[PDB]
Amino acid sequence: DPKRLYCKNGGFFLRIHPDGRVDGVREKSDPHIKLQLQAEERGVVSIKGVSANRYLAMKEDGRLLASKSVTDECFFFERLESNNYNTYRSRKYTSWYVALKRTGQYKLGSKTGPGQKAILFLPMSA
Amino acid sequence: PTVEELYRNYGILADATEQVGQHKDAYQVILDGVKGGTKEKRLAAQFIPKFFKHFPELADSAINAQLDLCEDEDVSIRRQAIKELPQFATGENLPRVADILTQLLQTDDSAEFNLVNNALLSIFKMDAKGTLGGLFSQILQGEDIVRERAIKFLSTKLKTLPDEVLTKEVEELILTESKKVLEDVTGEEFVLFMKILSGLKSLQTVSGRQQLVELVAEQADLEQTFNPSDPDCVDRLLQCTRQAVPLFSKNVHSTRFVTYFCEQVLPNLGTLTTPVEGLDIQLEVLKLLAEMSSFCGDMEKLETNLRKLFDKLLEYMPLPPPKLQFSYVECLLYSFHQLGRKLPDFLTAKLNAEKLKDFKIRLQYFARGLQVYIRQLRLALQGEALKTEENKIKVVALKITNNINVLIKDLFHIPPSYKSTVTLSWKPV
């Protein structure tokens, strides 16, 4: 089932562009916010942009890009929080979370931590 | 509890002289006044804070009694209680009062809103660090409405405090807390925090303004590669860079910004999109680069950036065989006149004899059509009619053409000179 990731910080939907950009948008019907959460090992998921055919990733300096192929940086720990909001922590860089800022851009992983409003994402239907 | 019993117990506590702490029963009757009606609560909002200093063993119950009055439905009851809140900020109670007052900033009653600001400024003079903790913790964690009002409070009411209050450690704490906020602010929030931080006395020095310049540099994310296709990528860089211009002096350099504009923005200036009507996105970039070029120091790749700036200038200075964009030339010719000082060999080298020969031909052909338009402007301008929107354009156009003509003559010395000084047209006297 395809889902949308609604960020608690500001209310942005996680968006993955065909060129590899990752950010947030408030429009409910953006074609690039339709995501597919593939389950890997127990507790680890992968986020794929449907309209972009790219997988969400976080590189060396905590920046979020969308590569066309699944790499080492495309696996994230999914932890369920309150309420129905989840946090996605990089499997390779185990201290940096996927996060969107109030401006809509991605938050640098080196400036993310547990208990932030920016790291909480809500899976939504449609 | 009625108004008769409250007035009688007020006299018991007032006429007690120095034997006040023993009439705890009389103060308890006043504390129970919050359970009464309108007239009973309007008296409790006055009497609870007046004798609060004489009963520390009832501090929690008294602060709670006043807090109930601060959340009463009647706005006149809240105004009576909020005004007397600084009386409770004694000892360990100030950070709790600071949190309540910061929470109360979201009121939309103009009379109540003023009383909350005066109470915040009151406990600010008492414990500046304690009040800031109550304000910044709501900016970092509270709702968006509280974060909005609290930022506006620092943006508008810090200038009203006496200089005795804003000590060095208070300004240090604000900068320490503001840098925690700047990691997640919007475009407008960053503009407010730059006014707050630059207003601090300890940050108005040469070293202080250099720290503020580094803050907007990390906010601009100058290591992020520039994308000319995104309309919001340009409007965010321009807005973030405009906050750095008022801080640049002869010893506070803009090299990190001039390097970014020359390396990544100038070679891609044609691909600039604007989603707002009546705004020339390319001229605003050139306007911003022209202001910064006056404070640029030793550059990383000086010759490469100078060539990229020189190539963009020749695009607007045609060879003699069209309309001339004097507004674009004023910004580009000024920036090259500023950065060209650092490398006169860019024109005065035997290898660059072809570039210098071609350049002086473009300057000479441009000056012919320029001086034609100068006296053509001064013909139409020969104190009240000058204030018309149709004539003010010719006034700034005369400043643009004069600045270009001064810079061309400075560069057309057989040894090209760079000592002329002009004032940009869109900058006042």
Numbering used by the authors:
A (entry chain B): 161 to 286
B (entry chain A): 2 to 322, 336 to 396, 400 to 446
Task: Please quote the authors directly.
Apoptosis inhibitor 5 (API5, also called AAC-11 or FIF) is a nuclear protein that inhibits apoptosis in human cells. The crystal structure of API5 suggests that it functions as a protein-protein interaction mediator with HEAT (at the N-terminal half) and ARM-like (at the C-terminal half) repeat protein binding modules. FGF2 is a well-known mitogenic growth factor.
To investigate the function of the API5–FGF2 complex and its potential role in cancer, we determined the crystal structure of the API5–LMW FGF2 complex at a resolution of 2.6 Å. The obtained structure revealed that FGF2 binds to the central region of the API5 helical repeat and provided a detailed picture of the protein-protein interaction interface. The major interaction force between the interface is the multiple electrostatic interactions when the surface charge distribution of the interface areas and salt-dependent decrease of the API5–FGF2 interaction are considered. Among these, seven highly conserved mainly negatively charged residues in API5 (Asp145 in the α8−α9 loop, Glu184/Asp185 in the α10−α11 loop, Glu190 in α11, Glu219 in α12, Asp222 in the α12−α13 loop and Arg237 in α13) form hydrogen bonds or salt bridges with FGF2. This region in API5 corresponds to the ‘convex’ side of the structure, which is also the central region of the API5 helical repeat that connects the HEAT (α1−α11) and ARM-like (α12−α19) helical repeats. Seven positively charged residues on the surface of FGF2 (Asn169 in the β1−β2 loop, Arg223 in β7, Arg262/Thr263 in the β10−β11 loop; Lys 267 in β11; and Lys271 and Lys277 in the β11−β12 loop) form hydrogen bonds or salt bridges with API5. Taken together, the interacting residues can be divided into segments of highly conserved basic (FGF2) or acidic (API5) regions (FGF2-segment 1, 261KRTGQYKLGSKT272; API5-segment 1, 142QGEDIVR148; API5-segment 2, 183LEDVTGEEF191; and API5-segment 3, 219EQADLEQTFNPSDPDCVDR237).
